Design a protein around this ligand. Structure first.
Ligand SMILES: O=c1ccn([C@@H]2O[C@H](COP(=O)(O)OP(=O)(O)O[C@H]3O[C@H](CO)[C@@H](O)[C@H](O)[C@H]3O)[C@@H](O)[C@H]2O)c(=O)[nH]1
Ligand SMILES: O=c1ccn([C@@H]2O[C@H](COP(=O)(O)OP(=O)(O)O[C@H]3O[C@H](CO)[C@@H](O)[C@H](O)[C@H]3O)[C@@H](O)[C@H]2O)c(=O)[nH]1
Ligand SMILES: [Fe+3]
Ligand SMILES: [Fe+3]
Ligand SMILES: [K+]
Ligand SMILES: [K+]
Ligand SMILES: [Zn+2]
Ligand SMILES: [Zn+2]
Lengths: 347, 344
């Protein structure tokens, strides 16, 4: 029979991780008698008097938040890393070894509006969000080789506070993913003489099958090797090492691309769409980081609808990540909707 | 200053995967205003007239389940892999490439009792399950190099049907986890001339800090490099390549170990403790597999209680797995409860 990706299971390679993804095109056909998701409330007040993240509010620690009107960053009250933790008793033990971990964790409130997420923020407000990301990265980068900007959106994504915002965790070392991505990109570069992701963008631009968002300076695709159902990869069309290297134009364009990307997500099921997202750029290790290409990953759990997510469990944990629909199907569904948040368009 | 694992963040290495785990011992003290889990109901019928996995019931596809006893295995009505899928077009492209994928998927009903989870089952019944896992492994191993026995238990673990049971997915290739575990174990062996987990078992025996369950032939510990809060690694004290290689004594002993382990898990929060678990053993690839050591991993998501789980999200996906308590603290908590199921 003729192989048909559209219908035959197969594995696809993730050149960033050196790992495969198993695709079973029709897995989703099976009866779902599992957990039903809890979709989020449409009606939240712009200011919650109890919210530990709201402006002019006291934190769990008593610390009072400023009367902030744009973004706001403060050191996490429960940081995952400290800048002066004692060094660990590092050894060579092939079985039980440990290593030192220093760094910090900061919290970023997107805006004082307790009820408005990224797709609902103005391009101007989004641009401030980017400037803050850059600011944070430049400062921490001065001290730590790995600065990780991210965000957990929605209960399904492990958020512990409903205020819109993100986090920044800095590390004295290169975490798993960073070291891997770093090495893999470096090898490709050494061999191909061009940045892996830069070449990837070209290919995607010429194809279109997986394109979701395309702006003057950015591209958002459902990567070939996507893991999560509607997972996306957001990249600059031009070669850029870190977030801190974006030009002002790329910067405002990024704000636009984000709004569009997240609006499509929310438009997909006509609901606030949960996800985990974050930025990957060259580490501040003082090395030649030409092999790098800045990029953001978006990992959303929703699959069938607003109340049915994907669960990366048994097989995925013990063997390999699996997907129940192609990246092409995912991208197509994402292209079908509007890139204007339903709340803003009034449709 | 003076380093103390329960107070200071640090990273631990997982030699099975060659990856690190970030430990931040006081992270769970933060307020939690996130999701609240829904704990599984305690009272369920022994037979559910509408259950697709229940004895004598008609499946989704209309096929009928027999009036079985003990375990019941059938080919998944929506298998994720097939035995005859056409080969993919293989290339050596550095950015966009695919590979073939063949195999099968089977469903294993633990017993005809719709309401009895593993720890609720007798050692005899559990022994029957072990026999089936073995038969299934030996069987599929004839055709596939990778046989994956597993179980998704509880809503939080993405289970799609409440009947107590698991799955077996076979693959014509070695999936990610298999390939790496094989490679790393092989490397270790070549250098140490001893199996990685065999040595590991001894090192743990000589410590006891992370021990949770210990029987004549098995050991269950919160691995040194544990990711999930109360994760455990279950393994035979003696070198055993695959589950099919167990002696009958080892097998009957494994059932005992399983009952004990799972009873402790349920007792931790006095609820049916969810998890994803599976078995890892030598692949059927006709190669020198002495480096292998059979073992089971249990990945339970619960963290603070019956309604609050651990989430591997943002930082974890973009950077590195992280934990809010030490392997040692968790092991202690597990040891603190009775190995007698709270509802026996
Ligand atoms: O008064 C307050 C209230 C909250 N916070 C912080 O606000 C953050 C909100 O972060 P969010 O992204 O919602 O989730 P977290 O509580 O950090 O935990 C999630 O994100 C982590 C990093 O991905 C994971 O390790 C957890 O398992 C996952 O639940 C938390 O870190 C809190 O420590 C404060 O600093 N002060
Ligand atoms: O009439 C029926 C009813 C059910 N089933 C099968 O019963 C199985 C029950 O397996 P379970 O462990 O409960 O979950 P799954 O539905 O397979 O899916 C989970 O397990 C997979 C393997 O880890 C993941 O890919 C998913 O994302 C995760 O939700 C399913 O696969 C069904 O296809 C049949 O074959 N016939
Ligand atoms: Fe990346
Ligand atoms: Fe393993
Ligand atoms: K958030
Ligand atoms: K199950
Ligand atoms: Zn708020
Ligand atoms: Zn049943």
């Amino acid at each position: 029979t003729q192989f048909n990706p559209v219908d035959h299971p197969h594995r696809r390679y993730n050149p960033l991780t050196g790992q495969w993804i198993l695709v079973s095109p029709h897995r989703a056909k099976r009866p779902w008698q599992g957990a039903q998701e809890t979709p989020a409330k449409q009606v939240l007040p712009a200011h919650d008097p109890d919210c530990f993240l709201c402006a002019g509010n006291v934190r769990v620690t008593g610390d009072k938040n400023p009367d902030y009107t744009g973004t706001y960053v403060f050191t996490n009250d429960f940081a995952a890393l400290m800048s002066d933790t004692p060094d660990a008793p590092e050894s060579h033990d092939p079985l039980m070894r440990c290593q030192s971990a220093r760094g910090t964790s900061r919290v970023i409130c997107f805006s004082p509006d307790h009820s408005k997420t990224l797709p609902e923020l103005s391009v101007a407000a989004l641009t401030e969000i980017v400037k803050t990301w850059q600011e944070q990265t430049a400062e921490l980068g001065k001290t730590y080789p790995w600065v990780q900007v991210f965000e957990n959106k929605g209960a399904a994504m492990g958020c512990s506070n409903p205020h819109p915002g993100g986090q920044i965790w800095a590390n004295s070392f290169l975490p798993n993913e960073a070291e891997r991505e770093d090495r893999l990109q470096k090898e490709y570069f050494a061999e191909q003489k061009s940045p892996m992701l830069v070449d990837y963008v070209q290919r995607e631009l010429a194809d279109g099958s997986r394109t979701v968002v395309e702006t003057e300076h950015w591209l958002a695709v459902v990567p070939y090797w996507a893991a999560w159902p509607f997972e996306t990869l957001l990249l600059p069309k031009a070669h850029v090492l870190r977030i801190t290297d974006l030009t002002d134009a790329q910067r405002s364009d990024l704000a636009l691309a984000l709004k569009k990307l997240t609006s499509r997500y929310d438009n997909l099921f006509q609901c606030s769409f949960p996800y985990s997202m974050g930025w990957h750029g060259a580490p501040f290790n003082g090395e030649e980081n030409q092999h790098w290409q800045l990029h953001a990953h978006f990992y959303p759990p929703l699959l069938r609808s607003a109340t049915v997510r994907k669960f990366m469990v048994g097989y995925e944990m013990l063997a390999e990540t699996q997907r129940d629909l192609t990246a092409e199907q995912a991208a197509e569904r994402l292209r079908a909707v509007s890139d204007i948040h339903f709340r803003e368009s009034g449709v």
